[PDB]
Amino acid sequence: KSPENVYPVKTFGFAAKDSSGFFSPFNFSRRATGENDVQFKVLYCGTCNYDLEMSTNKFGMTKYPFVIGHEIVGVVTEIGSKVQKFKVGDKVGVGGFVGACEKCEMCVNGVENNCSKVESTDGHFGNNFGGCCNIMVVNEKYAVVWPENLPLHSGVPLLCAGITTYSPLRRYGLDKPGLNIGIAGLGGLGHLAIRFAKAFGAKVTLISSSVKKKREALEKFGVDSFLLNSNPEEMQGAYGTLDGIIDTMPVAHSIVPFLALLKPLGKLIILGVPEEPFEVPAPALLMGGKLIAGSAAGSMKETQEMIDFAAKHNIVADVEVIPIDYLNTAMERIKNSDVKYRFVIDVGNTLKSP
Amino acid sequence: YPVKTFGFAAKDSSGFFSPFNFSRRATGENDVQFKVLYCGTCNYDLEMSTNKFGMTKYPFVIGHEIVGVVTEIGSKVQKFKVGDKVGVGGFVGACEKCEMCVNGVENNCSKVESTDGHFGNNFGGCCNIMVVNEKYAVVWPENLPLHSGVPLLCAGITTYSPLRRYGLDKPGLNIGIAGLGGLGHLAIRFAKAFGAKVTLISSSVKKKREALEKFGVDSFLLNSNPEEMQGAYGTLDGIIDTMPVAHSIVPFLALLKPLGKLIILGVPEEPFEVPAPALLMGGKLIAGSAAGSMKETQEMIDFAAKHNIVADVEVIPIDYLNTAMERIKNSDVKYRFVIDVGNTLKSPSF
Ligand SMILES: [Zn+2]
Ligand SMILES: [Zn+2]
Ligand SMILES: [Zn+2]
Ligand SMILES: [Zn+2]
């Protein structure tokens, strides 16, 4: 029965035992390194609002005991006999999923993140324990080749917040030099969205409800224009100018002004999840043939491509590195967005054997 | 202008149509002049004639979907000879020198010239003679009937364009059509010819029988039954939604596979309530679409001819036009009125 006795590789980390979401030391086990597997010592594990939501069981479908960790990097300790991509001592990353059915339309076409049988790394779809623990093991297919010129501690949120912004920027053709790209909201998702857009060669506009952020965007993100969305004169002046908009705002807001900012054939991408639904008048879409698209996560192909891109363009996240016994306080901070902009748990140095 | 013409026009916002004399330009070097044989009409003309939106230039000659026969041509005209058949859709000019123009989507130009005069100072094709720049004239194939083909230049292009733009034109795909009206019935016909397994989505049980029996539609979902809608969750590559009435699209997004596309073609007054999770779970999109470009329109006409696609139409004499307008209001026509200008437009008495 007991998780530590199931498999032969003994592991330890931190787990939520109930819907209170309190993380505490947890012993468990993982499979032996099979022929196609990559075992690794976890060095850093990102976290974010998704883990707050899951750990407190916001959707009523969490399986306790729950071990977070959908954005992890570490150092390879063992490789199976048929592994190509890694040798022992190489760095590796694991994102949101570790498996899929490998046979459906989605899998066959390299978009296996959309597999109805996708296997979440943290085991919210399936039975699995996430990488906030000492040792991880993963099928080669689902392991990111992590280059030595991409810092681990500040790179790790690319596997969560990064791919989320990068994927739609490529999918909707918002990655060409000289395009005008808007980002709404300068937080976890938006800050990386800006760094990607800049690297693609876009003229970047920050759209925001707070003037505080204007100076930040200009000084620290090289942002070209700032639009305060509560200022209609400012907003109206940029009508029909943006090729696309990455909307990261989690608060209730209207997207009709955002649709109006787009050129004809332009794209609104929604990445935040307000509790308030959006009100979308048919005419706002039909005038100029505009689209609104949602996006979460990305494929393995897209995730490797992004990490390669980030390494080459020196793109990392703003992070606060924390010891693992700070996890429960970090969750409180995530609740209040009191982090600039992502927590990264230093597992390598601060997780000790029980 | 010197070319002496006559047609029908509305004078005030009553929307009443009567004989109206006017004139067009002589044929320039890039121009095609034709005798009008058929003139499509639709809800757009009802709205513009009654000044729904408040920016209608009177007197208003309708006719944004017309066909006929070439009478004369300009010096530098390549695409037409005299006696050929020809069509004109919803715009006759654009600025030519902008981004939207250079890339072949001039319908998105902000200085775009409407055939009916609405963006511009023009008179539409509900009249004896037309003249248009050759770029904005469609080459009409001999095996496409004129009377039943003319509404393609409006309803046809409107359904065809997004089917192409959003990759919903591949054989084998599961394509939903919501609403079986004017747009709906041509959307079904195009999707069938592309090779798709078509599902009709409708609020009306009457439409189930119509879809199977008359369009060879595979599947039907009633959108007021949650149990039937639940059973098709995550099965469709795209939906073409033509419904003009207030309705939720949260169920429609739910019908889409991951990476699936919802195309809005109707224009309800009620806005759509769209929860973020409905777009985000599956990475789905909602896009608007009306009309299309000249390249696409010509291409759509060749495809319609090649695959025996026409609209269902009621051909009407011109003195029925005012009655036709109450019937367009009541949604009482299967599925588009086509005015027999060629046989029924009389020349005004001297
Ligand atoms: Zn995360
Ligand atoms: Zn699969
Ligand atoms: Zn029409
Ligand atoms: Zn133009």
Q: Are residues B33 and B81 in the same domain?
A: yes
From chain B, the residues in CB contact with A287 under 8 A are 288
Query: How far does the CA of residue A178 sit from the closest CA of chain B (Å)?
Result: 14
Distance from the Cα of residue B265 to its chain's centroid: 10
Q: What CATH number is associated with residue A255?
A: 3.40.50.720
From chain A, the residues in CB contact with B272 under 8 A are 279-282
Residues in chain A: 354
Residue-wise DSSP of A80-97? -TT--S--TT-EEEE-SE
Q: Are residues B238 and B135 in the same domain?
A: no
- Buried b / exposed e across B77-114, counting CB within 10 Å, b at 16+? beebeeebbbbbbbbbbbeeeeebbeeebbbbbeebbb
Which of A265, A272, A285 has the CB atom closest to B286's CB atom?
Answer: A285
| Helices B294-306, B155-165: crossing angle, 10 deg rounding | 100
Q: Are residues A65 and A20 in the same domain?
A: yes
Q: Are residues B304 and B164 in the same domain?
A: yes
Query: Which range of residues forms the domain containing residue B47?
Result: 1-154+312-350
Helix (H, G, I), strand (E, B) or coil at A121: coil
**A199 close contact with B: CB closer than 8 A:** no
Spacing, Cα A119 to ligand 2 middle (Å): 10
Which of B110, B285, B289 has the CB atom closest to A293's CB atom?
Answer: B285
Query: Residues A191, A196, A198, A203: what is their CA dihedral angle, to the nearest 10 degrees?
Result: -90
Tokens of A257: 């002004």
Contact between A322 and A344 (Cβ < 8 Å): yes
From chain B, the residues in CB contact with A294 under 8 A are 276, 278-285
Spacing, Cα A103 to ligand 2 middle (Å): 5
Please give the Cα distance from A174 to B206 (Å, whole number).
Answer: 44
Contact between A303 and A144 (Cβ < 8 Å): yes
Q: Are residues A10 and A127 in the same domain?
A: yes
Which of A277, A290, A296 has the CB atom closest to B273's CB atom?
Answer: A277
Q: Which residues pair with A270 in a beta bridge?
A: A247, A294
From chain A, the residues in CB contact with B258 under 8 A are 106, 111, 114
**A147 close contact with B: CB closer than 8 A:** no
Q: Are residues B190 and B232 in the same domain?
A: yes
Last residue of a domain, one of B311, B326, B342: B311
Q: How many CB pairs below 8 Å do chains A and B form together?
A: 100
Residues whose CB falls within 8 Å of the CB of residue A256, separated by 6 or more in sequence, listed in order = A279, A280, A281, A284
Contact between A353 and A48 (Cβ < 8 Å): no
Q: Are residues B246 and B284 in the same domain?
A: yes
From chain B, the residues in CB contact with A283 under 8 A are 267
Q: Are residues A154 and A6 in the same domain?
A: yes
Spacing, Cα A261 to ligand 3 middle (Å): 29
Please give the Cα distance from B262 to B278 (Å, whole number).
Answer: 12
From chain B, the residues in CB contact with A114 under 8 A are 257-259, 282-283
Provide the strand spans (E) within A169-298. 180-184, 203-208, 225-228, 242-247, 262-270, 278-280, 291-294
Query: How far does the CA of residue A239 sit from the closest CA of chain B (Å)?
Result: 13
Q: Are residues A149 and A169 in the same domain?
A: no
Spacing, Cα A111 to ligand 3 middle (Å): 40
**A260 close contact with B: CB closer than 8 A:** no
Q: What CATH number is associated with residue A47?
A: 3.90.180.10
**A250 close contact with B: CB closer than 8 A:** no
Spacing, Cα A178 to ligand 1 middle (Å): 30
Q: Are residues A289 and A225 in the same domain?
A: yes
Query: How far does the CA of residue B240 sit from the closest CA of chain A (Å)?
Result: 13
Tokens of B24: 């067009």
- Residue for token digits 């980390």? A13
From chain A, the residues in CB contact with B271 under 8 A are 279-282
Total count of domains within chain A: 2
Tell me whether strands A262-270 and A242-247 are parallel, antiparallel or unpaired: parallel
Q: Are residues A115 and A174 in the same domain?
A: no
Q: In this structure, which ligand is nearest to the CA of B337?
A: 3
Q: Which residues pair with B178 in a beta bridge?
A: B201, B241
Q: Are residues B302 and B326 in the same domain?
A: no
Q: Is there a contact between A278 and B276 if contact means CB atoms under 8 Å apart? A: yes
Interface of B with A in 89-108 (CB under 8 A): 100, 105, 108
Please give the Cα distance from A44 to A161 (Å, whole number).
Answer: 15
Distance from the Cα of residue A247 to its chain's centroid: 15
Contact between A56 and A10 (Cβ < 8 Å): no
Spacing, Cα A68 to ligand 1 middle (Å): 9
Tokens of B60: 């208003």
Q: In this structure, which ligand is nearest to the CA of B64?
A: 3
Q: Searching chain A, which residue's CA lies closest to the CA of residue B270?
A: A281
Give the best residue of A50, A262, A280, A290 to mutate against chain B (max B CB count within 10 A).
A280
